[PDB]
């Protein structure tokens, strides 16, 4: 709403989750790409397309429910109806990497980033690298899109997980 | 439950090598060799028997006659008073 | 000077001995920081850290030492006899180890292996079977049944029962401390 | 399905028969070993291998009915007519070595392992031994397989024990 | 002082400083380390004998009470019932029952908190109530959530304590 | 089977100790020496040549042998009303 | 050749298998000392010098013959046909000191580190360290062997003797 | 090089019963800590180097302790010692590193058979007040127990004497003669 | 497969008797460290396999082990071997492993009767000093008692013929024998 | 082998304590006095030996000049009806 | 004698022989103290110090004589000689402080840091020396400090090679 309250949300932020916001913030931003999420809310806010009310839902999408309650004074009922009586900001192409990425611990990212070094650049692999930051770089060359689900599905099945194929299956049926 | 457990421990309390070493054998169909390797107490070997359910304070006919079978007379009518 | 004395008490102590001073000490060293101790000295210097073992003070110590049964150190390098321990300990107000903990490990000096089986064989409601691992102290069964809130200060009934179900020797100290008020 | 019930299961299990599942469960976790019973559960619930009845005919093979009593509320009636109208978890091959295993007390599996010393290597099976562990360490050099089974067989016949031969036979005539 | 804070800083382990910054984690921006949070504190004027004596009665290291501010347990605990205002009850209810779990209870925990949990490195009890805070259902008026999770590791006493600390307000 | 196990335990209850002898030495060509060393009872001895399935409880044609060269007809005589 | 067949040898050895692995290829590997088995798999895959063959030679050398069957798709036949045409990759000498230190148990292997303290600088570790840190001081060569061998007679094993001698005499 | 295996083979000769009767004359030089975890005499032989009681040039402890357990043969096997020089450096005042107290309480352990021991153990209740009466115990672990609790020590003999006055008077005579040798 | 076949199947037909006597025969080769842990022939085996003494090319001290503890049906069941061959493999200089000392002393053990131990136990009592009060000893035990405080040797016999000596003349007879072959 | 076993047990069984001192008298000189002061009876004796491979089934002529010198008749004939 | 040597010898050694390599350099880095191993070896190529003599010593000095029969062609003899009769480029007061190090048992540095704690006021003796140091306690013509508290821990036997080289300052 005000410039102090970006602030608060801001300080209040790790930057394990700052990626996390980037990512979730890819569909609406498409002028640049902001390094810090300070400047990311600041261009929303500029946009127009920011407003009080709709943040909270970018809360719900991080797990913050914390500042729900500390600064905007809802609960999960009132995000829930807000967001059935009102269009998502965010696809849920979005959210469900996301909760992929969740359920995804060091042991099963360096599985799949080194099963996945070939695919990308050879001299690239020496930065390090996140599930999220991985996907990103696949979607660079589209090998994956909103749509299509056939190379992640496999090389989850790759490394011997069901239950996200599941879920992916659940996704693609649903959309 | 608690009685069942306390006339389990006194009934095994009454008992000798000879006669542990018969009970041993005598049970050899419900419990393999390895078990009955390091088995050298009674109560021991009452609690591998009950994991398969077999002596229950349901149903403690099978202990009865694994009893009687020994000859025990003090011991079988003690049994049979603890549920009365 | 002062640390090398410590050093002295804490290289005579066997493994047994040292998990027994690790039980005597629940109260003031929680269980969190009781699991990195593995020798006499890590214990001495957690006792340092909360200011009750220092150089002008050793009754602690002191205390600790003669509750284990254990006067070779107290008359070589705490210089000390045991008649003097005696008229300290008299004080009530100078008993810094509560007579719940001296009661419980007496009790636990008293059972002997197959006493030891009895026990885990007589209690499988409360305390699960793998846990037992068949072969744990009586220390072990003892923090556990305090963990789980069965043996408790005012709850000494179980205690008891078991009792009158193995000995009748442990019994007489279990009433005359109940006794003591 | 729930964390709970797999804890309770951990915890109720005594460490004799952990070595036993842990065998048991080898051929649904081909590519990975778990290190304790924990872990291969939860590899298995992660797999969707993982429900009511697999646990239930788990606790069946490992001879637990108490536990299949007060945990799945279960008896041996319902879990065996579930067995004969559902394919089985584990092959007849792994339950054959359980239970022969299960009938050779300290002073046999000694026998064993000096009697094959030729074959395989010496300083490994040096330690104090069962006979899974034995059956394992042949497995790993492809001596025994589930067609193959006339090394174990004559090695038991040499150690003068006849009905475990017998029940050899018997398993081989019946597949 | 200003500059003692440097010799209270050489003497803690890393432990205690992870166990300080969750008991000031109260007071609203998050130090990355203890020295900023203590220049912060400083700063904002709250910096105070009184008061980090009371810290340091609370995180139990009465030999620095003894030696850098030249003062007993009994001075603070005198002190303390004038203004409690650094750290509260159930801060220090938590940080004194993350005190009291081992390896294996802790283990069990974060496997049965893995339900209904972000699976995302091993970590302490300190490390998930902080998490259980940002999931917001661990406030100082509601317990019950964290009394049922704790039952199934059968520790009764730490549900004595919670049932204690229900009744103490 | 578990009336065969109560019959075998009944057998082997009413040897003696110079009987049980002369069995461990008449089981020498079967048995091997150190394991006939360790028995203590006509009991394992029986639990023994039931392992090597030359007696079974089928077929107790070597245990009527047995108990016919011992000179004792009253065991064989039960073990014959067993079988009928 | 694919990261597949890597992920999975990764996932199906154990640790005990893996330090003798690491023991093999350090002679190969004389530039960089790998403390894991997929950097070192990527090292051998990069250079060049790993290939079907290789990695059955490899893992036929630590005696895990079902993971050829499985992974490989091969039977011991056609590696052990292999070997006996094409050229080995690890020299006799290292293969020669696994099969030395997988006979040994911890009362020897402490009674020589007893008896070869005098010679070196404590800690308790297999025999493959041992020769490690003897060969860390030039010791132990593929073409020197007195002292190992006169060390092993004096603990009473001669089996190992009489393997070393053999060794000797095929040069 | 010659040394360290000539070592080992002493140390290869020794049983557990030596080994113990070693761990219990040689408990002074050594503290517990460090005296637990010796699972070997190699162990032993290690930390007696480590204190600077033996090495290649000073052999004067080991020949000791290997003739007070009346283990004449390795003396002379390894060592190159008669029984006679050994017997005539232990007279000579000064080079007895080993107190008189130590071999006296073993020479006792020497003498007691099994019913002697359980007798001994049955007869000291009031000391160890119901401590540990188990059968299993040694009668040099009943020597160390009776010692941690100060009831017997260098000059305070008068529960030993005490207690072996029932069994035996020839162990009486032992006692007499090391007092007479103070 | 089949050779440790046969040595298993040797190794089951021996009872505790023969195993102590294997054991005591042997104790040169093996040392005590190493023959405690013993408890059954097959770690016997195992140990003098890996001394490189008995292997499928060379049987020849297990013959010879069997054919002195007085055992022949194995030796010409299992290993195929008459009375006769094995006589005239030990008559030629060379082949014999086991020294005349350790067989004579074992054919002297085999010839005491229970009152005859007890004699010879009270005879020299005095050397070991009441150390051997012990009714439940055998006398393979008292033979190594004495080896280890070197009163008993492979050159020193005085001890051992005094004591025959006053026990028998037979065991004498044999000792003269032995004496009169060296 | 079976009836060779069988008929040493026979003929063992007739012995007497009289004809047992008779027996380890004159097998002294056979083996040493150890062996002999635990033998309890003729069937051990015959059993130890089967050790020395003196007795075996295919030459009994030890066998019989030891019993002939017992002048047992009865004895003689019955191994002579067992080997023809 | 290029920088690619120096790269493979930094690459080749082990974590604790960087350690010890960092600690024994300490007389000659009074100018500047490099953290990183390569910054300490390029540094002291750059002032022209770092020979191949110089190399030798150090190889020699850490026990890595297959690092000097592989890539400098040279034996323990040679350096030996070289040592001998050439100038030594680091005082026999580092030397002893690093034997000492190595031949404390892991259990006894946690019994000397208790000890040691009381002066000043997880970590290695190297570490512990170089704190005293800082103190300015323990200096290479003063050892009671040291010599003492190693007596008092019952570990007699490196006092005699402390004694030892007391004795050879002379």
Same mark, same amino acid.
């Given at each position: 709403?005000?410039?102090?309250?970006?602030?608060?949300?801001?300080?209040?932020?790790?930057?394990?989750?700052?990626?996390?916001?980037?990512?979730?913030?890819?569909?609406?931003?498409?002028?640049?790409?902001?390094?810090?999420?300070?400047?990311?809310?600041?261009?929303?806010?500029?946009?127009?397309?920011?407003?009080?009310?709709?943040?909270?839902?970018?809360?719900?999408?991080?797990?913050?429910? +914390? %500042?729900?309650?500390?600064?905007? &004074?809802?609960?999960?009922? *009132?995000?829930?109806?807000?967001? @059935?009586?009102?269009?998502? $900001?965010?696809?849920?192409?979005?959210?469900?990497?996301?909760?992929?990425?969740?359920?995804?611990?060091?042991?099963?990212?360096?599985?799949?980033?080194?099963?996945?070094?070939?695919?990308?650049?050879?001299?690239?692999?020496?930065?390090?690298?996140?599930?999220? +930051? %991985?996907?990103?770089?696949?979607? &660079?060359?589209?090998?994956? *899109?909103?749509?299509?689900?056939? @190379?992640?599905?496999?090389? $989850?099945?790759?490394?011997?997980?069901?239950?996200?194929?599941?879920?992916?299956?659940?996704?693609?049926?649903?959309? | 439950?608690?009685?069942?457990?306390?006339?389990?421990?006194?009934?095994?309390?009454?008992?000798?090598?000879?006669?542990?070493?018969?009970?041993?054998?005598?049970?050899?169909?419900?419990?393999?060799?390895?078990?009955?390797?390091?088995?050298?107490?009674?109560?021991?070997?009452?609690?591998?028997?009950?994991?398969?359910?077999?002596?229950?304070?349901?149903?403690?006919?099978?202990?009865?006659?694994?009893?009687?079978?020994?000859?025990?007379?003090?011991?079988?009518?003690?049994?049979?008073?603890?549920?009365? | 000077?002062?640390?090398?004395?410590?050093?002295?008490?804490?290289?005579?102590?066997?493994?047994?001995?040292?998990?027994?001073?690790?039980?005597?000490?629940?109260?003031?060293?929680?269980?969190?920081?009781?699991?990195?101790?593995?020798?006499?000295?890590?214990?001495?210097?957690?006792?340092?850290?909360?200011?009750?073992?220092?150089?002008?003070?050793?009754?602690?110590?002191?205390?600790?030492?003669?509750?284990?049964?254990?006067?070779?150190?107290?008359?070589?390098?705490?210089?000390?006899?045991?008649?003097?321990?005696?008229?300290?300990?008299?004080?009530?107000?100078?008993?810094?180890?509560?007579?719940?903990?001296?009661?419980?490990?007496?009790?636990?000096?008293?059972?002997?292996?197959?006493?030891?089986?009895?026990?885990?064989?007589?209690?499988?409601?409360?305390?699960?079977?793998?846990?037992?691992?068949?072969?744990?102290?009586?220390?072990?069964?003892?923090?556990?049944?305090?963990?789980?809130?069965?043996?408790?200060?005012?709850?000494?009934?179980?205690?008891?029962?078991?009792?009158?179900?193995?000995?009748?020797?442990?019994?007489?100290?279990?009433?005359?401390?109940?006794?003591?008020?």
């Amino acid at each position: 709403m005000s410039a102090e309250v970006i602030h608060q949300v801001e300080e209040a932020l790790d930057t394990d989750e700052k990626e996390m916001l980037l990512f979730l913030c890819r569909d609406v931003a498409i002028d640049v790409v902001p390094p810090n999420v300070r400047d990311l809310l600041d261009i929303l806010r500029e946009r127009g397309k920011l407003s009080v009310g709709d943040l909270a839902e970018l809360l719900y999408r991080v797990r913050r429910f +914390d %500042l729900l309650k500390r600064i905007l &004074k809802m609960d999960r009922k *009132a995000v829930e109806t807000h967001l @059935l009586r009102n269009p998502h $900001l965010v696809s849920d192409y979005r959210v469900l990497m996301a909760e992929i990425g969740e359920d995804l611990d060091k042991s099963d990212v360096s599985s799949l980033i080194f099963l996945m070094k070939d695919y990308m650049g050879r001299g690239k692999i020496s930065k390090e690298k996140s599930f999220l +930051d %991985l996907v990103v770089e696949l979607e &660079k060359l589209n090998l994956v *899109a909103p749509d299509q689900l056939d @190379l992640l599905e496999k090389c $989850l099945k790759n490394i011997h997980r069901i239950d996200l194929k599941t879920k992916i299956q659940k996704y693609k049926q649903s959309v | 439950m608690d009685p069942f457990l306390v006339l389990l421990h006194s009934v095994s309390s009454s008992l000798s090598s000879s006669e542990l070493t018969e009970l041993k054998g005598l049970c050899l169909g419900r419990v393999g060799k390895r078990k009955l390797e390091r088995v050298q107490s009674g109560l021991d070997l009452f609690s591998m028997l009950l994991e398969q359910n077999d002596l229950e304070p349901g149903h403690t006919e099978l202990l009865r006659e694994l009893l009687a079978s020994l000859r025990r007379h003090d011991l079988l009518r003690r049994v049979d008073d603890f549920e009365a | 000077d002062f640390s090398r004395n410590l050093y002295d008490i804490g290289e005579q102590l066997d493994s047994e001995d040292l998990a027994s001073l690790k039980f005597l000490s629940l109260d003031y060293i929680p269980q969190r920081k009781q699991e990195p101790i593995k020798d006499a000295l890590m214990l001495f210097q957690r006792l340092q850290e909360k200011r009750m073992l220092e150089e002008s003070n050793l009754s602690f110590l002191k205390e600790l030492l003669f509750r284990i049964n254990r006067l070779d150190l107290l008359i070589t390098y705490l210089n000390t006899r045991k008649e003097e321990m005696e008229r300290e300990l008299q004080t009530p107000g100078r008993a810094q180890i509560s007579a719940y903990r001296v009661m419980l490990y007496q009790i636990s000096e008293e059972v002997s292996r197959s006493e030891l089986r009895s026990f885990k064989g007589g209690l499988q409601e409360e305390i699960s079977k793998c846990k037992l691992d068949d072969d744990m102290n009586l220390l072990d069964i003892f923090i556990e049944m305090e963990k789980r809130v069965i043996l408790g200060e005012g709850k000494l009934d179980i205690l008891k029962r078991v009792c009158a179900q193995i000995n009748k020797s442990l019994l007489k100290i279990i009433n005359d401390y109940e006794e003591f008020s």
